[PDB]
Design a protein around this nucleic acid. Structure first.
Lengths: 127, 125, 99, 155, 79, 207, 60
RNA sequence: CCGCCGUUAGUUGCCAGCGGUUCGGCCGGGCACUCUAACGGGACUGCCCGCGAAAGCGGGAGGAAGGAGGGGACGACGUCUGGUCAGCAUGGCCCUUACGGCCUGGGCGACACACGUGCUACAAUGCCCACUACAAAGCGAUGCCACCCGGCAACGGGGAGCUAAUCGCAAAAAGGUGGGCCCAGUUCGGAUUGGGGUCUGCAACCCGACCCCAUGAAGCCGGAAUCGCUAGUAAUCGCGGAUCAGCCAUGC
RNA sequence: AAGGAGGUAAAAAUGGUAAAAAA
């Protein structure tokens, strides 16, 4: 009845709800074409429903908050790729060689003490 | 356009044209711009002389500029030589008037730097 | 209508308390709001290696205090009775508040 | 490293067109962590080409790539307290990289009016063959040729 | 410094009023170079306390609302 | 040549605090102060028969004067009298509600603090370091650990050069977490300076 | 010096801006964590000794 | 600690289910979903194709997770007669109405150079003005202070709520949308400095910070040589805290 | 291509730094 996807990237929660339709996809209260206005990685995150051609046949409710805008976009990619892998486990077997299953492995490493930016070491002297 | 001390700015926003003047910043620009009337966005070249004249009339009347100003400062500086208050003591010394630092940094209140020979140090290896 | 908050030092006896307490309430009364995990209160400390002037190379340390929540619905004689005195939190204190 | 052979690692299949090289050039225009406005700039430039001439943007892109190709790049040989200044047949990967980056700094060099404008005009002349990155391509070629004594002195 | 009021020793007030109650001999021997040269000090010799000696300054007017020991250099050698 | 505190290493589930009570942000400091003064006063004027644990259970006014000692008898008093004055010294200096405890471990060569304590006691009374101390390591290994590293630093008989002495036997993995190593440090003090006595006793896994 | 310093902090002077922290289990004023009322090395030693409550050898 | 999934939990969340809505998850209710925090599950070259006398090796599959999955805390035997009795201890040595205490000021902020580390800059990917959204973490009761009013601002007056996932710091900046500037020491840069206010605290001269008008310098991208950086790493940009009345914080 | 060995060409701008001693 609903297509749900848990979308997460660099800590940002893309709660992805789905019903069928045309293009009604509201991101946390607003249309896609404003809640991520200007950013080019936005349309890229629309790839999952584009590479299955069923981008139209959906009427989404997409609650998405936490972390960062672009990160939310990537998180939307994950939420979609998790929402459709639910209500058609056949797309699953072919979707893995594209990677639309992997979540992430790239979060901001802790400020390492002894260095400035967690790895960026301060200047040397000796002389 | 010699409103202020031979001040002639030419074709630009009236605000920038007014700011190209001693004793008149951008805040003062919008200030006299709201007090004399003249519109900021409109260029200073294509103006109309009436608003211009009443404008310059308001300008020099409510506040003054370079002539008295810097001279006034230098007079307060004469006082800073009066018994040589620590402010003017150091201002006479050719050094920063604040109580900052002179171990190293002093490249504007004083000139650049005046080379010596170091005098060296104690063991460091 | 009973709102009890758990203030402790270690999650161990913290939830060990929460188990019997809630059950004993479910025992001598009725419905009990399960031991909700209030975001564990932790503090931050950052010292250095030795006393001698080193600035860099250090050891960091952090305070561990734990917070939880338990509620019920009825002020039964028997609940009040048991869940009053019958305690041994040793190193844990709590807060009774109403709603 | 000295145990490994590092890598190159796949970049990005272009967030728009669908090609690695587009967002590679974007990657080098990029203002250190601000891919945002740099990518925007490049694209404004692209559509502006497509409002100027008639030839395809990816086409003229491949033309930038080719028209600035360092077929043989100069380096140095092993001989103790001395090094032979020695050119060598480069790999298409390193040629592409060098190329696109030279188009990048040739785009930076032009004192024009705006970023998109710069990248654009740069791409015009340089794809045509009357550009600076091109001048350094042809250059390193002359260098490789004049150093054809260092032909079997390639490390 | 001060904003609503103005700092000076109260003993400076009370001791202005006395040497004013006679127009008496010179020397004010302040053992605190702080205390502003507030208006009612006219222009008499101020042997303000340094830490070394007692810097004696004949005050004028170009200094009124600005600290006493603000006139003693103390820090020897300049440049 | 370090060794981050193996006991501060044990902090996971391999060593509970020597003070378990509730401290609410505010009163926590004064709690730590009062309690540390209790501890410190004990450590000397309660010495007599050597203790390890200086544990205290508190909450609201309630106090638990809890101690792990190597002897209870000749430290409780000839008529339960030593407990009296001491406990009430606590109560007098900490006016609330005190409750003594003299729990005893039936083994001395087990538990590193007191082992090191005796080790330092021998040298404090001017004994031949290496001999007696190595055979003390052998005592602990006549008790039954899986390792015992009792190093001893400081001035060795004087001779200015204060080095460190190597005494150990059996494997000791203080790197390992589930090793459960009691470590105990005793202060050696000669009239010619200060020497260090570290005991490292390793117990066992699966605990 | 040192002894009178503790008395200065013990007696607590006249004006407010004269007080200063003090590691009671070592005796120091600077960098004394005014949560534990302890210095940096005081704190470190007391934590490592298996004595400091609440806190743990942080390894986040 | 951190990415996928598992059990419990519901004043954070939530219409996902329904009712209403000054149409605010605000008014009822659920726990699936966010989430919060304890016990877990999961990955081992375990499997598929080939190579290697083995280790190992390429490629491929299922997988959130591929062969060390990422970061931490972990730092032996021991070198350095390394440093520190000026955090703390402790051998000796010296002084003992003073090499001890107080108080008060001055000072460790000095300036003719030198150097180390750092900040903002020199700029059209730019700065200025307008407009709208996504942070994790930490802090907070004579603290946090919402809020309204006062003032050009600094900041002050009245005044709700909180020992807090339920009240507040809080204004994220970058992005993005609208206009200026139009290659000039430029509306670039804020250094010098005076002119006046506030706030701190007993009290701000040497010595705090903050604000308002103005002066608006140097500086037009840095040779001999050298810093860091292998993946959410460079860089860019913001945020909280420790200590604190205040703040010299471009520090950590 | 292994070792081991036998006869031929290689490679250091400079460096002074003591001492009764401690186990």
């Amino acid at each position: 009845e609903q297509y749900y996807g848990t979308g997460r990237r660099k800590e940002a929660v893309a709660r992805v709800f789905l019903r069928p339709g045309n293009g009604k996809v509201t991101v946390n209260g607003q249309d896609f074409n404003e809640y991520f206005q200007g950013l080019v990685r936005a349309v890229a995150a629309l790839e999952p429903l584009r590479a299955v051609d069923a981008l139209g046949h959906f009427d989404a409710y997409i609650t998405v908050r936490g972390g960062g805008k672009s990160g939310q976009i990537d998180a939307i990619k994950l939420g979609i790729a998790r929402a459709l892998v639910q209500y058609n486990p056949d797309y699953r077997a072919k979707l893995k060689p594209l990677g639309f299953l992997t979540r992430d492995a790239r979060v901001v490493e802790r400020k390492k003490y002894g260095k400035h930016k967690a790895r960026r070491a301060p200047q040397y002297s000796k002389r | 356009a010699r409103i202020a001390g031979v001040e002639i700015p030419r074709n630009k926003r009236v605000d920038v044209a007014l700011t190209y003047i001693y004793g008149i910043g951008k805040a003062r620009a919008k200030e006299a711009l709201e007090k004399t009337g003249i519109n900021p966005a409109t260029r200073v070249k294509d103006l109309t002389e009436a608003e211009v004249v009443r404008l310059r009339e308001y300008v020099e009347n409510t506040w003054k500029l370079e002539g008295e100003l810097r001279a006034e400062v230098a007079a307060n500086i004469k006082r800073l030589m009066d018994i040589g208050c620590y402010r003017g003591l150091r201002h006479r010394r050719g050094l920063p008037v604040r109580g900052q630092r002179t171990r190293t940094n002093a490249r504007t209140r004083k000139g650049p730097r005046k080379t010596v020979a170091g005098k060296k140090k104690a063991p460091r290896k | 209508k009973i709102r009890i908050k758990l203030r402790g030092f270690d999650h161990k006896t913290l939830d060990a308390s929460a188990q019997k307490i809630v059950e004993a309430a479910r025992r001598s009364g009725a419905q009990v709001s399960g031991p909700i995990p209030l975001p564990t209160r932790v503090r931050r400390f950052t010292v250095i290696r030795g006393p001698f002037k080193h600035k860099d190379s250090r050891e960091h340390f952090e305070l561990r205090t734990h917070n939880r929540l338990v509620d019920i619905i009825n002020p039964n004689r028997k609940t009040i009775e048991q869940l009053m005195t019958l305690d041994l939190p040793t190193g844990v204190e709590i807060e009774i508040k109403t709603v | 490293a000295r145990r490994r052979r590092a890598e190159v690692r796949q970049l990005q299949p272009d967030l728009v067109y669908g090609d690695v090289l587009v967002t590679a050039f974007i990657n080098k225009i990029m203002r250190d962590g601000k891919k945002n406005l740099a990518a925007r700039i490049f694209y404004d430039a692209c559509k502006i080409i497509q409002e100027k001439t008639g030839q395809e943007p990816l086409k003229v892109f491949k033309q930038a790539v080719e028209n600035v190709k360092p077929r043989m790049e100069v380096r140095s040989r092993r001989v103790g307290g001395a090094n032979y200044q020695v050119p060598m047949e480069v790999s298409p990967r390193r040629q592409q990289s060098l190329a696109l980056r030279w188009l990048v700094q040739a785009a930076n060099q032009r004192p024009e009016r705006r970023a998109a404008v710069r990248i654009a005009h740069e791409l015009m002349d340089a794809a045509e063959g009357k550009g600076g990155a091109v001048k350094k391509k042809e250059d390193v070629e002359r260098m490789a040729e004049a150093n054809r004594a260092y032909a079997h002195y390639r490390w | 410094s001060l904003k609503k009021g103005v700092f000076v020793d109260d003993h400076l007030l009370e001791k202005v009023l006395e040497l004013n109650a006679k127009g008496e001999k010179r020397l004010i021997k302040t053992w605190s170079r702080r205390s502003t040269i507030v208006p009612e000090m006219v222009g008499h010799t101020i042997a303000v306390y340094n830490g070394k000696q007692h810097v004696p300054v004949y005050i004028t007017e170009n200094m009124v609302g600005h600290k006493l020991g603000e006139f003693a250099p103390t820090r020897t050698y300049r440049g | 040549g370090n060794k981050i505190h193996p006991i501060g290493f044990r902090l996971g589930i391999t060593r509970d605090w020597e003070s378990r009570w509730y401290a609410g942000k505010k009163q926590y400091r004064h709690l730590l102060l009062e309690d540390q003064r209790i501890r410190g006063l004990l450590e000397k004027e309660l010495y007599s028969a050597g203790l390890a644990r200086v544990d205290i259970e508190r909450a609201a006014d309630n106090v638990a004067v809890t101690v792990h000692v190597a002897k209870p008898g000749v430290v409780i008093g000839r008529g339960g009298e030593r407990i009296r004055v001491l406990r009430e010294e606590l109560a007098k200096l900490t006016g609330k509600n005190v409750a003594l405890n003299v729990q005893e471990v039936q083994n001395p060569n087990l538990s590193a603090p007191l082992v090191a304590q005796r080790v330092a006691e021998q040298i404090e009374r001017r004994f031949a370091v290496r001999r007696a101390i190595k055979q003390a390591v052998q005592r602990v290994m006549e008790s039954g650990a899986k390792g015992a590293k009792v190093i001893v630093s400081g001035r060795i008989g004087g001779a200015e050069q204060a080095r460190t002495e190597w005494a150990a036997q059996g494997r000791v993995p203080l790197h390992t977490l589930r090793a459960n190593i009691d470590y105990g440090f005793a202060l050696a003090r000669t009239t010619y300076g200060v020497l260090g006595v570290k005991a490292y006793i390793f117990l066992g896994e699966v605990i | 010096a040192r002894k009178a310093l503790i008395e200065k902090a013990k007696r607590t002077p006249k004006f407010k801006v004269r007080a200063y922290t003090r590691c009671v289990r070592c005796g120091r004023a600077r960098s004394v964590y005014r949560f534990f009322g302890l210095c940096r090395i005081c704190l470190r030693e007391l934590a490592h000794k298996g004595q400091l409550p609440g806190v743990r050898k942080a390894s986040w």
